[PDB]
Structures are given as C-alpha cells and as structure tokens.
Amino acid sequence: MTEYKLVVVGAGGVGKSALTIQLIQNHFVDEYDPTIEDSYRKQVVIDGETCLLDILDTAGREEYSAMRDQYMRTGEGFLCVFAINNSKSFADINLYREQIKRVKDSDDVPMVLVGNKSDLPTRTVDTKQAHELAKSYGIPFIETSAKTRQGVEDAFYTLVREIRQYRMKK
Numbered sequence: 001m002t003e004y005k006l007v008v009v010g011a012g013g014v015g016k017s018a019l020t021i022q023l024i025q026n027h028f029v030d031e032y033d034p035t036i037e038d039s040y041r042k043q044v045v046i047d048g049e050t051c052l053l054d055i056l057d058t059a060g061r062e063e064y065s066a067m068r069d070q071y072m073r074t075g076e077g078f079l080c081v082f083a084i085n086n087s088k089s090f091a092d093i094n095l096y097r098e099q100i101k102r103v104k105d106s107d108d109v110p111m112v113l114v115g116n117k118s119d120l121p122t123r124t125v126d127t128k129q130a131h132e133l134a135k136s137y138g139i140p141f142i143e144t145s146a147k148t149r150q151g152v153e154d155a156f157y158t159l160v161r162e163i164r165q166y167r168m169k170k
C-alpha cells in the first residue's frame with residue numbers, strides 16, 4: 001500500500017486535534033489540551049486504493065514555531081486549519097502557507113484549506129473570504145466541524161487526492 005505523510009497545521013485552538021481525533025476515533029474532544037506533537041498511522045480505503053496515512057498533529061502555540069521547518073520538509077500534504085469564529089487564525093493561514101512554500105521551494109505543495117467550527121452561530125470569517133483565499137492559492141477549501149463530524153473525511157481524503165495528483169503530475 002501507498003503511504004501519505006499528512007501535516008495538520010494552524011493557530012492554537014482552531015481544532016487540529018479535535019479534527020484528527022474525530023477522523024481516527026469518531027469522538028469529539030470537548031476539552032482544550034494544547035498539543036506539543038502527536039502522530040497517528042491509519043489504514044483507510046480511498047477510491048479503491050489502500051492508504052496508510054501518517055498524520056502529524058502539530059502545535060499551534062507560537063512558542064513551538066521552531067519544530068516547523070523539519071516537519072514541513074518531510075510532510076507531503078498540509079491541512080491548513082483556521083476557525084471560522086477566529087479572524088486571527090484565518091490571517092495566520094497566509095503565514096503557514098508562505099512558510100511551507102519557502103521550506104519546499106515550491107509554488108504547488110498538496111494543500112487543503114480548512115474552515116473549522118462550522119457548527120457555531122458566531123462566525124467572524126464569511127465563506128466568501130475563505131473561498132476567495134483558497135481560490136487565490138489554487139487549493140480545495142473544506143468547511144468542517146470536529147463536533148458534528150461535518151467535512152472531516154472530506155478534508156483528509158481531499159488532501160490525499162491532492163498528493164496523489166501531484167505525484168502522478170511530477
């Protein structure tokens with residue numbers, strides 16, 4: 001089977017861990033426990049191809065902005081997560097993408113934009129800004145909720161599809 005190293009990146013508290021744990025355990029983590037760095041290996045079937053996903057759940061805390069370089073070189077796909085109710089986390093996406101492009105020295109890195117916490121009545125970033133940002137990067141935009149499980153599989157599986165296309169393309 002084919003391996004895919006996926007990196008989940010974004011500001012602290014956007015729901016990187018809640019999304020990964022929802023994908024892997026079908027459980028919603030309601031408590032906020034700031035991640036240092038966790039990794040999970042999961043076997044899933046995607047479009048009839050058996051995939052071995054090696055998911056890296058990274059630290060959103062800015063004091064861990066030094067571990068980034070190593071995992072950005074090794075990562076094959078990046079799940080760039082922001083929370084739709086946190087404008088700063090949306091602005092932080094540009095910074096994560098610029099860093100990934102510098103480290104990879106490339107314009108096209110397999111990447112998916114994720115708007116998490118879609119279950120909340122208090123969005124500060126409207127869907128139009130999000131769609132336009134992803135459009136400007138040339139990447140899929142997925143709306144998710146780690147609480148309801150909305151778009152969780154779509155987010156990770158779209159990223160795998162982006163990597164697969166990139167490999168077939170290169």
Ligand SMILES: Nc1nc2c(ncn2[C@@H]2O[C@H](COP(=O)(O)OP(=O)(O)OP(=O)(O)O)[C@@H](O)[C@H]2O)c(=O)[nH]1
Nearest residue numbers: 012013014015016017018030034035060117145146
């Ligand atoms: N309503 C709602 N709450 C969410 C969602 N995703 C995460 N949360 C909550 O937001 C808080 C932070 O979620 P985390 O997954 O721990 O955030 P994180 O990005 O992994 O944080 P760091 O590891 O510090 O970067 C927790 O209280 C979660 O329950 C979601 O889609 N909806």
Ligand SMILES: CN(C)Cc1[nH]c2ccccc2c1[C@H]1NC(=O)c2ccc(O)cc21
Nearest residue numbers: 005006007039054055056067070071074075
């Ligand atoms: C191999 N898995 C058990 C863990 C794992 N999953 C990943 C998914 C994407 C990118 C990297 C990784 C790693 C690590 N492998 C590395 O080379 C590396 C460098 C720095 C790190 O912070 C972490 C890793």
Ligand SMILES: [Mg+2]
Nearest residue numbers: 016017034035
């Ligand atoms: Mg976390």
